[PDB]
Amino acid sequence: NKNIDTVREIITVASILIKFSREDIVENRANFIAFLNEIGVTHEGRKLNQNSFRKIVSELTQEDKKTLIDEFNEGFEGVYRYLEMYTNK
Amino acid sequence: NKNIDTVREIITVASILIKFSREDIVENRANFIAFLNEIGVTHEGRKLNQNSFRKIVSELTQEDKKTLIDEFNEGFEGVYRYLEMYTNK
């Protein structure tokens, strides 16, 4: 629906790669975007574009992030340092 | 939010698993539920249970399934064969 929904399922997904200890895929946004289209993570039901990716992950409000922090306590903490930093453009 | 939302992020995560050729996890609902508790797919802001898992996948409407067909073109073709057959109880 909005931005969080998509970040949400890419949080789980990239924590798979963290679970398997393949943080290298996570370590670059573009490689990861490609990876996104490949395994089929969509935004608003559409394919996920390079610019429109960066706006989803980065431009979130504090609210959206608190909502992730509340539901994905330990999970988002770690992987959201990773996801944030690797798309510090 | 609703059942579809749940299946949605769990879909992409299991296409990760078949990307890595780890269909052993996908091949049974229970192993998958365990893995759901691992990576942290939380449904209605709550922990995902064995019975509550089977509802999310099963009770979907034809419209909900068609919704995933339309939004997750490539992915739900593949993984939703797999996902559906392995939880025909």
From Swiss-Prot, chains A, B:
GO biological process: regulation of DNA-templated transcription
Gene3D superfamilies noted in UniProt: Anti-Sigma Factor A (1.10.1810.10)
Record SUPFAM superfamilies: Anti-sigma factor AsiA
Record keywords, A-Z: Transcription, Transcription regulation
Oligomer and partners: Interacts with the host sigma factor RpoD, and thereby inhibits its interaction with the catalytic core of the host RNA polymerase.
Biological function: Transcriptional inhibitor. Inhibits sigma 70-directed transcription by weakening its interaction with the core of the host's RNA polymerase. This allows Gp55 to successfully compete for the core enzyme. Plays an important role during the prereplicative period of phage T4 development.
Listed name of the protein: 10 kDa anti-sigma factor
Organism from which the protein derives: Enterobacteria phage T4
